[PDB]
Amino acid sequence: TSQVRQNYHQDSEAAINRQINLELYASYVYLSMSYYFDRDDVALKNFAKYFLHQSHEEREHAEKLMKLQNQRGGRIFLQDIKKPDCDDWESGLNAMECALHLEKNVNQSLLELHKLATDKNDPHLCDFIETHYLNEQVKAIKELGDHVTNLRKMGAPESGLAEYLFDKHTLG
């Protein structure tokens, strides 16, 4: 046992390792999207910038969970990072909808993690999740929902002018 470990259940340690893999996977998905919008036949540079920033943020989320795992005396066990579901993300609206679905999946995983921490009476882990992850997820989901709403109302994906102007005025 680690000399620092206290009130840290093995189930919580395993769930944190699963969350680390999920955040790394999300970072990879966002990287894939970013460079889709960098293609010469897509060419939406602010969509590309937006998703690259999301990718870097998800990497930071994963690293913060790894730091937590070490702080509590758990042991990090890394797994393969699976490739994203798509190479071709088809449009700015479709990528935003996929990002929204992904963020809601990550939020569900975080809520299950919080439930596990409550069940194991680990208030430090509960507070960690609440303080660093839950409101960030709610804000991200709300922002993506707003983006989807605006793109749909402007006429995307059938209006390329819509995605061009959204790229310039909302993401620029």
d(CA 166, CA 2): 51
Among 107, 78, 109, which residue's Cα sits nearest to residue 15?
A: 109
- Find the shortest distance in angstroms from Cβ 24 to a second copy: 8
- Find the shortest distance in angstroms from Cβ 104 to a second copy: 6
The pair of structure tokens assigned to 22 is: 């999920």
**Burial (0-12, 13-18, 19+ Cβ within 10 Å), 50:** buried
**Interface of this chain with Zn ion, residues 66 to 125, rule: CB under 5 A:** 70-71, 73, 75, 77-78, 80, 82-83, 87
Asked if residue 100 lies in contact with residue 30, where contact means CB atoms within 8 angstroms, the answer is no
Smaller CB separation from Na ion, 6 or 131:
6
Asked if residue 26 lies in contact with residue 102, where contact means CB atoms within 8 angstroms, the answer is yes
**Interface of this chain with Na ion, residues 34 to 93, rule: CB under 5 A:** 78, 84, 87
Per partner kind, with CB cut-offs from 5 to 8 A, the member of a second copy, Na ion, Zn ion, none near residue 150 is a second copy
Asked if residue 114 lies in contact with residue 130, where contact means CB atoms within 8 angstroms, the answer is yes
Residues contributing to the site for Na ion (CB under 5 A): 6, 32, 78, 84, 87, 101, 104-105, 108, 139, 142-143
Residues contributing to the site for Zn ion (CB under 5 A): 11, 13-15, 23, 39-40, 45-46, 56-61, 70-71, 73, 75, 77-78, 80, 82-83, 87, 127, 130, 167
